[PDB]
Design a protein around this ligand. Sequence first.
Ligand SMILES: CC(C)(C)c1ccc(C(=O)C[C@H]2CC[C@@H](O)[C@@H]3[C@H](O)[C@H](O)CN23)cc1
Ligand SMILES: *[C@@H]1O[C@H](CO)[C@@H](O)[C@H](O)[C@H]1NC(C)=O
Ligand SMILES: [Zn+2]
Length: 1016
Amino acid sequence: QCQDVVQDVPNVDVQMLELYDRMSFKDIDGGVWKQGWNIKYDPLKYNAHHKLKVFVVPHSHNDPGWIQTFEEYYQHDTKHILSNALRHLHDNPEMKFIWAEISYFARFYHDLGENKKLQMKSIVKNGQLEFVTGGWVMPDEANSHWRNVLLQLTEGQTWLKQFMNVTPTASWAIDPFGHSPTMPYILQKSGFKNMLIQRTHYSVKKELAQQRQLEFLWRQIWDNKGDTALFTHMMPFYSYDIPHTCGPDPKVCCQFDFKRMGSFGLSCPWKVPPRTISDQNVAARSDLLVDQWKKKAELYRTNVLLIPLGDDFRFKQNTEWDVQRVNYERLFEHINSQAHFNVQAQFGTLQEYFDAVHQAERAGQAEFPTLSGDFFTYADRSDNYWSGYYTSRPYHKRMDRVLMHYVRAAEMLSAWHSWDGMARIEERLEQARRELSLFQHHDGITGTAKTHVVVDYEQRMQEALKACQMVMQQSVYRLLTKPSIYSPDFSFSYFTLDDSRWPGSGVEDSRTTIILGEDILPSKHVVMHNTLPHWREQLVDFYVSSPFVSVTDLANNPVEAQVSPVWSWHHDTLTKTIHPQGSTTKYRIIFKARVPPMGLATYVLTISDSKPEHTSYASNLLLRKNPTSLPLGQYPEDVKFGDPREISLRVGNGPTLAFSEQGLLKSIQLTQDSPHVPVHFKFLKYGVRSHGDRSGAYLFLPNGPASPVELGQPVVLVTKGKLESSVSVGLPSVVHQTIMRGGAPEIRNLVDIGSLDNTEIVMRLETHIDSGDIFYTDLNGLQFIKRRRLDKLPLQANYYPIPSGMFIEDANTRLTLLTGQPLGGSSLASGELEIMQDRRLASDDERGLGQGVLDNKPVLHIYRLVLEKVNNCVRPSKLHPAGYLTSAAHKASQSLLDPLDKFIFAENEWIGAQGQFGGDHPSAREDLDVSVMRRLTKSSAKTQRVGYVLHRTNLMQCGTPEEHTQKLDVCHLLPNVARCERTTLTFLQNLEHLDGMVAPEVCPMETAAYVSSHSS
Ligand SMILES: CC(C)(C)c1ccc(C(=O)C[C@H]2CC[C@@H](O)[C@@H]3[C@H](O)[C@H](O)CN23)cc1
Ligand SMILES: *[C@@H]1O[C@H](CO)[C@@H](O)[C@H](O)[C@H]1NC(C)=O
Ligand SMILES: [Zn+2]
């Protein structure tokens, strides 16, 4: 049945880790093709019976924000490009154009008058204007979570199906900074047949070009059979611009960019301008151009050649459409009429190219190689590796993951019911999906936009978060109120969300205190939501106005709780120390919530005059020389003081952690009898070069290995409780916290790089683990890929995206660091892991941004740190390119990305309150997730439809007996099911009508989508 993703090493023609191991990466001057060689061809290769078919594909690369905001670019550029495309294509039936970014197209189309909408539909229907990919954006592939890549793809394609009646099956990704196999994974499961990529390391382009392996069947690294394969075309040259798309010599190709003759303010840096094509020069101009084409064709296996014709925000003015079209028409008429060239050239679309390639393949003229792996870390030239943007603007990288989860929770919570249009549910969800989707752009989440554009993305995401909160809290109120009592005001806040980790303590004072008192309000209901499809327990905390608070479930059963102080860290500009202050009127109450699969659970917080039976109080110990008092109001335990010293902590039966006198982890002891394993946290700094190329938003160009941050004698705070303990230390630029709840610790860093120009702050772990040169990092939160550190490459080349986790291991021991935000990282020596926290760069790095990164703001980064024995685990063989998490590490990642949601009832009394929702939902096996639950129909539809995306990961077998769990059939989650269909991941095409209306569970590493239809 299911493929084995662990024990069968796929046999592929090109495996990128193996290729990397072999390649020398020499950066030699190749001639006019600076990073290649002087291409030679046999003029006799093409003849009357075997012609070269050339497709010139006009395009315009439109960024949804970069140097201008989305709306600024729309007003200044994109609306004119689309208006003039409509006119020019209408009037010139053989002209063609491709379009990628549906965020822009949807904005444009909705503003068109009906006559023009109809004209637009006609040029799409007739194949002149073709959508490529059809996502809301052209996303980053490094930092983006797969769930959000799918979200934005679905947003654009759903719009295209509704308004344009088309669904692209070819993808175009010319600008993201390196490429991920997560893209073909999602695309192939969304109906695609072909994809195109561009930004891959120049040494990779050279190597693959030499072997004619630039077109390949790209399969996943674990896929033995090849069912995940997607045909992929990699472009061969340095850029997608016209100089780098006609052939290997940009001095020649630039002369065929007819916008560069002067009047448009553009020119050719190779110092030979374009000249207007005429009868007196067409033969000569054609001989130069066809020669470039035939050289390019040498790099590929068929007689069908792709020639993109475009650049950033091109095809804006009428005069530009004319100058490109008329000159190319003259070239085509000459070339096609002169038999000696043996060429047939025309304007075409991307799909037309791929269709012709596969026709050639089926005619037996070519066979294509198979490939697995990724295309990180990209370098466009010399030692300029683009690993900086794995970290740039980390506040917004963290915000991405928070909004990811809020969109999921809002769509899921509201899916259970049909809503009246007056509730504005669909409206708020569309807004939230679109703002999160926009941020997936390769200048959004990447942190590579101008300051004011970053602010625009942030404002949009803030509005999206508020939209999600509104939908979530309306849904909770409906799900947990007696039906005959429920009386909604769709504008009212029945609950407010409480989020302990966003924006975070020390970032924003955003959380509401639950105010209780004998003379105001004795008690408060709170509700937790669990978006995961299994029963889950998690500690939750709330701020309360008294320490004398106890917790009950709605059956009035006492729940054990812990109260701790509210501690805030302050950079004391008088004493020049960083030290914690405690509140004398707010306290934290902490208790274990237990919540059904995809469900809700209600608890009550009640005040009393004195210490409640079932609530304990943490001790607090402040370690510093020169302490001063720390009063805590009614908090019943006095703060203790001491000189800095090593300390050890253990919560529950979990690990025992030892810390240095500077408050940093030094060892983990898994069990009572077991060893104290060395695991040391350290903070270091990278700088910037004083000569040569400077680091900026894209590039990481360190001035050598990192240097330790000088710590001084930092203040350390130890809080010890029955349920939760922690060690926090105020370091320069980082308040570092290790939190213990009885399992793997949680690490939080409040990172404020302040005014430290030209500094990158890294967090490193040093261990004994004999990892050598191997480490593992994830791709888009979907899969873990084996990395090999290569000393033949510079330090920055060995940095990779850490979108959600990384690990090192030897025969016996593994250390895994899971993240709540994408950041850059590496393992630069055996036994180490490191991950960048923030970077502040004074200089521009010459990729068009025109500024450094000087807009840093405090960010709360979150992690889980999992030390495990793996000697008993069934792991892939030494040649397998993948790795897999254990159950504990996977659950730890879920605790970061999809925590319980917390709701505080706003009013004094909740009439008709219920204790639970979802107690009857199946508790699915731990490796299965309902990644998406989305109602697809509005309330007017007689047949309601609900869509589910189901993802099964693969966890290592390590000898923990499996306990029986329940089968999850998503098609029966809502009553009155009438049909169940397997669909593409975007929900746009029905693939299978399912027997018995039962949606089968998926195989390890597979993702499927199902839609259930309901008659009532
Ligand atoms: C002229 C010079 C300053 C030397 C320059 C060099 C390279 C680039 C890009 O690669 C820009 C690429 C690559 C980086 C990316 O941020 C941008 C935008 O998305 C836009 O679509 C083009 N993208 C730009 C300028
Ligand atoms: C939409 O596309 C399909 C496939 O070509 C076609 O059968 C259908 O009639 C089109 N719908 C409209 C309204 O043109
Ligand atoms: Zn771009």
